[PDB]
Design a protein around this motif. Structure first.
Motif, PDB file in Angstrom:
ATOM      1  N   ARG A  18      79.235  42.739  40.821  1.00  0.00           N
ATOM      2  CA  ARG A  18      79.145  42.078  41.914  1.00  0.00           C
ATOM      3  C   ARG A  18      78.605  42.782  43.329  1.00  0.00           C
ATOM      4  O   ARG A  18      79.182  43.727  43.645  1.00  0.00           O
ATOM      5  CB  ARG A  18      80.526  41.418  42.696  1.00  0.00           C
ATOM      6  CG  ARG A  18      81.354  40.778  41.519  1.00  0.00           C
ATOM      7  CD  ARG A  18      82.573  40.522  42.250  1.00  0.00           C
ATOM      8  NE  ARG A  18      82.484  38.890  42.455  1.00  0.00           N
ATOM      9  CZ  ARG A  18      82.722  38.397  43.811  1.00  0.00           C
ATOM     10  NH1 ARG A  18      83.238  39.259  44.690  1.00  0.00           N
ATOM     11  NH2 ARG A  18      82.464  36.990  43.877  1.00  0.00           N
ATOM     12  N   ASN A  23      77.178  43.008  46.738  1.00  0.00           N
ATOM     13  CA  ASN A  23      77.454  42.403  48.369  1.00  0.00           C
ATOM     14  C   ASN A  23      76.135  42.087  48.905  1.00  0.00           C
ATOM     15  O   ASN A  23      75.346  43.016  49.097  1.00  0.00           O
ATOM     16  CB  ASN A  23      78.211  43.397  49.075  1.00  0.00           C
ATOM     17  CG  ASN A  23      79.594  43.409  48.385  1.00  0.00           C
ATOM     18  OD1 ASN A  23      80.111  42.749  47.755  1.00  0.00           O
ATOM     19  ND2 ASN A  23      80.624  44.190  49.459  1.00  0.00           N
ATOM     20  N   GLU A  68      73.751  44.824  50.498  1.00  0.00           N
ATOM     21  CA  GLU A  68      74.561  45.914  51.244  1.00  0.00           C
ATOM     22  C   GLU A  68      74.296  47.123  50.548  1.00  0.00           C
ATOM     23  O   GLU A  68      74.350  47.153  49.235  1.00  0.00           O
ATOM     24  CB  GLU A  68      75.987  45.584  51.727  1.00  0.00           C
ATOM     25  CG  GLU A  68      76.113  44.159  52.533  1.00  0.00           C
ATOM     26  CD  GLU A  68      77.513  43.930  52.776  1.00  0.00           C
ATOM     27  OE1 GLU A  68      78.291  44.604  52.348  1.00  0.00           O
ATOM     28  OE2 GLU A  68      77.565  43.425  53.691  1.00  0.00           O
ATOM     29  N   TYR A  69      74.466  48.384  51.265  1.00  0.00           N
ATOM     30  CA  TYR A  69      74.475  49.554  50.529  1.00  0.00           C
ATOM     31  C   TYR A  69      75.725  50.083  50.221  1.00  0.00           C
ATOM     32  O   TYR A  69      76.316  51.036  51.094  1.00  0.00           O
ATOM     33  CB  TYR A  69      73.512  50.737  51.329  1.00  0.00           C
ATOM     34  CG  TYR A  69      73.475  52.031  50.617  1.00  0.00           C
ATOM     35  CD1 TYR A  69      72.524  52.167  49.539  1.00  0.00           C
ATOM     36  CD2 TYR A  69      74.117  52.883  51.035  1.00  0.00           C
ATOM     37  CE1 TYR A  69      72.180  53.457  49.023  1.00  0.00           C
ATOM     38  CE2 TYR A  69      74.162  54.357  50.337  1.00  0.00           C
ATOM     39  CZ  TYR A  69      73.059  54.662  49.511  1.00  0.00           C
ATOM     40  OH  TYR A  69      72.922  55.673  48.775  1.00  0.00           O
ATOM     41  N   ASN A  70      76.523  49.625  49.251  1.00  0.00           N
ATOM     42  CA  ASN A  70      77.681  49.945  48.936  1.00  0.00           C
ATOM     43  C   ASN A  70      78.075  49.388  47.572  1.00  0.00           C
ATOM     44  O   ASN A  70      77.241  48.997  46.860  1.00  0.00           O
ATOM     45  CB  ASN A  70      78.649  49.337  50.037  1.00  0.00           C
ATOM     46  CG  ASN A  70      78.815  47.829  50.177  1.00  0.00           C
ATOM     47  OD1 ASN A  70      78.442  47.339  49.120  1.00  0.00           O
ATOM     48  ND2 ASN A  70      79.222  47.243  51.249  1.00  0.00           N
ATOM     49  N   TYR A  71      79.320  49.522  47.215  1.00  0.00           N
ATOM     50  CA  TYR A  71      79.733  49.072  45.739  1.00  0.00           C
ATOM     51  C   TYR A  71      81.119  48.754  45.738  1.00  0.00           C
ATOM     52  O   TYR A  71      82.026  49.193  46.361  1.00  0.00           O
ATOM     53  CB  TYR A  71      79.262  50.362  44.845  1.00  0.00           C
ATOM     54  CG  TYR A  71      78.601  49.935  43.635  1.00  0.00           C
ATOM     55  CD1 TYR A  71      77.264  49.792  43.681  1.00  0.00           C
ATOM     56  CD2 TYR A  71      79.508  49.796  42.492  1.00  0.00           C
ATOM     57  CE1 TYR A  71      76.740  49.203  42.304  1.00  0.00           C
ATOM     58  CE2 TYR A  71      78.957  49.422  41.326  1.00  0.00           C
ATOM     59  CZ  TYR A  71      77.830  49.072  41.290  1.00  0.00           C
ATOM     60  OH  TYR A  71      77.048  48.529  39.961  1.00  0.00           O
ATOM     61  N   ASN A  72      81.375  47.992  44.444  1.00  0.00           N
ATOM     62  CA  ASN A  72      82.515  47.260  44.233  1.00  0.00           C
ATOM     63  C   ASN A  72      83.319  47.990  42.947  1.00  0.00           C
ATOM     64  O   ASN A  72      82.652  48.698  42.359  1.00  0.00           O
ATOM     65  CB  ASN A  72      82.560  45.779  44.035  1.00  0.00           C
ATOM     66  CG  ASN A  72      82.437  45.390  45.393  1.00  0.00           C
ATOM     67  OD1 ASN A  72      82.516  45.900  46.583  1.00  0.00           O
ATOM     68  ND2 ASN A  72      81.646  44.157  45.381  1.00  0.00           N
ATOM     69  N   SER A  73      84.544  47.623  42.818  1.00  0.00           N
ATOM     70  CA  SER A  73      85.227  48.046  41.501  1.00  0.00           C
ATOM     71  C   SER A  73      85.136  47.044  40.201  1.00  0.00           C
ATOM     72  O   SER A  73      85.189  45.929  40.656  1.00  0.00           O
ATOM     73  CB  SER A  73      86.548  48.391  41.798  1.00  0.00           C
ATOM     74  OG  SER A  73      86.416  49.523  42.782  1.00  0.00           O
ATOM     75  N   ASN A 116      85.678  46.592  35.508  1.00  0.00           N
ATOM     76  CA  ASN A 116      86.098  47.136  34.391  1.00  0.00           C
ATOM     77  C   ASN A 116      85.070  46.857  33.404  1.00  0.00           C
ATOM     78  O   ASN A 116      84.291  45.753  33.305  1.00  0.00           O
ATOM     79  CB  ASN A 116      87.439  46.164  33.913  1.00  0.00           C
ATOM     80  CG  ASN A 116      88.202  46.494  34.549  1.00  0.00           C
ATOM     81  OD1 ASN A 116      88.988  47.439  34.985  1.00  0.00           O
ATOM     82  ND2 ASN A 116      88.953  45.342  35.092  1.00  0.00           N
ATOM     83  N   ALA A 125      81.087  55.065  44.930  1.00  0.00           N
ATOM     84  CA  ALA A 125      81.061  54.944  46.703  1.00  0.00           C
ATOM     85  C   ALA A 125      79.799  55.645  46.756  1.00  0.00           C
ATOM     86  O   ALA A 125      79.481  56.665  46.089  1.00  0.00           O
ATOM     87  CB  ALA A 125      82.022  55.738  46.964  1.00  0.00           C
ATOM     88  N   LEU A 126      78.797  54.912  47.507  1.00  0.00           N
ATOM     89  CA  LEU A 126      77.525  55.300  47.973  1.00  0.00           C
ATOM     90  C   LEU A 126      77.303  55.796  49.193  1.00  0.00           C
ATOM     91  O   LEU A 126      77.863  55.263  50.294  1.00  0.00           O
ATOM     92  CB  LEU A 126      76.513  54.305  47.678  1.00  0.00           C
ATOM     93  CG  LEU A 126      76.796  53.085  46.705  1.00  0.00           C
ATOM     94  CD1 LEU A 126      75.356  52.175  46.341  1.00  0.00           C
ATOM     95  CD2 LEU A 126      76.969  53.753  45.238  1.00  0.00           C
ATOM     96  N   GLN A 167      84.781  52.867  39.366  1.00  0.00           N
ATOM     97  CA  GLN A 167      84.966  52.927  40.828  1.00  0.00           C
ATOM     98  C   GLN A 167      83.684  53.745  41.545  1.00  0.00           C
ATOM     99  O   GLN A 167      83.755  54.639  41.133  1.00  0.00           O
ATOM    100  CB  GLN A 167      86.107  53.505  41.510  1.00  0.00           C
ATOM    101  CG  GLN A 167      87.382  52.395  41.152  1.00  0.00           C
ATOM    102  CD  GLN A 167      88.462  53.045  41.658  1.00  0.00           C
ATOM    103  OE1 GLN A 167      88.904  52.989  43.048  1.00  0.00           O
ATOM    104  NE2 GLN A 167      89.579  53.896  40.975  1.00  0.00           N
TER     105      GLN A 167
END
Lengths: 222, 222
Positions: free
Chosen positions: A160, A162, A134-139, A141, A198-199, A196
């Motif tokens: 990770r 998605n 998917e074209y998105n992103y997670n948080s 450390n 965001a795309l 963090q």
């Protein structure tokens, strides 16, 4: 004092994944005060052979906000402006791997990130070449620790991604940074960068591209 | 044409979680063209009794970018300016639940979101009251579907909150939106909003607060 206000950033990547070659150029600004990054990327060779999200970690941790009580643990900035060399081996689970090497440093009044990436062993029907991410992103450390022998740091983390069907694709990162200059540098105590991202897309933009917004803050030391 | 440029946003929340009361005020701008949101929140009653991340979904889906071929599925905007009423029951796993009700609509040339929240059954030593959540956020898809009978939509999704020890806390959302006005509205085909968020702090800010950046895009219809 180099990262005192908004610093322009310039990125250049030449890669090769399973024989396919590509170039990416990016431009942006960084503000170590808010630990905010705003970058934009364009595939200059046409269409990107791998999903955009897999290049986020590769495409400038020197813009992290380091709280005041954590200032002596900031390797990244303390290496400026000669810069430093960042290397990683990223292992995509049940798939291949990207091997990267970059020089991040100031060229004039611009922070530049020049990278070269090589990916081998990717499954054709996998999430990566198959573009199932998917074209998105997670948080995450980013754990950081000093490498006194090499006068730098080592870092490691698991991203990770998605996949469309609902599952997740782990990408294990192993990192290494060494100074380009020859003088003392700041070697940190163990700590981490809470990152963090965001795309998104510029709707008036025809080329294959990604707009990236990140926030990074150091944490872990009391 | 109301969401043609940058629209100012104003948020007001009055809550109560296990007998503890609190107020939150927020201000920002939205740009449905990029589907970008920039908001800032302040707990006006002192210190927030629950972790900031648990209020993100509660604290304006009308700013989602809807591709051109998806314009007739945009309930949110088609309800403006009389606005609509949003309600949710959010179930935190192995913990309690927030019940919310808000009116989102234009007051002058400002999009306002007035909310009232009630949370009951929260475990004292849990991740929520125990403040064990990391201050960051992940990416999710908000499934949306019409509720023709009520002339609105129903939506649902599961948020994953990163706990400090590495695990995740699921928060099941169940949503319902109904128009405040009396005329026809746009009822959509099944689809979803790909949402991404990034949390941070204004370093020159003393009050309990959260700065929020989100990007939303509709997807699902070909």
């Amino acid at each position: 004092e180099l990262f005192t206000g908004v610093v322009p950033i310039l990125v250049e990547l030449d890669g090769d994944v399973n024989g396919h070659k590509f170039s990416v150029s990016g431009e942006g600004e960084g503000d170590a005060t808010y630990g905010k990054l705003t970058l934009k990327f364009i595939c200059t060779t046409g269409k990107l052979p791998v999903p955009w999200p897999t290049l986020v970690t590769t495409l400038v941790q020197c813009f992290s906000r380091y709280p005041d009580h954590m200032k002596r643990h900031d390797f990244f900035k303390s290496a400026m402006p000669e810069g430093y060399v960042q290397e990683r081996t990223i292992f995509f689970k049940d798939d291949g791997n990207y091997k990267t090497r970059a020089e991040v440093k100031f060229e004039g009044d611009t922070l530049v990130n020049r990278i070269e990436l090589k990916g081998i062993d990717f499954k054709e029907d996998g999430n990566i070449l198959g573009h199932k991410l998917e074209y998105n992103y997670n948080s995450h450390n980013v754990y950081i620790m000093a490498d006194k022998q090499k006068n730098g740091i080592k870092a490691n983390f698991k991203i990770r991604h998605n996949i469309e069907d609902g599952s997740v694709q782990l990408a294990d990162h192993y990192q290494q940074n060494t100074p380009i200059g020859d003088g003392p540098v700041l070697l940190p105590d163990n700590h981490y960068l809470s990152t963090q991202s965001a795309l998104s897309k510029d709707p008036n933009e025809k080329r294959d591209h990604m707009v990236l917004l990140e926030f990074v803050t150091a944490a872990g030391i009391t």
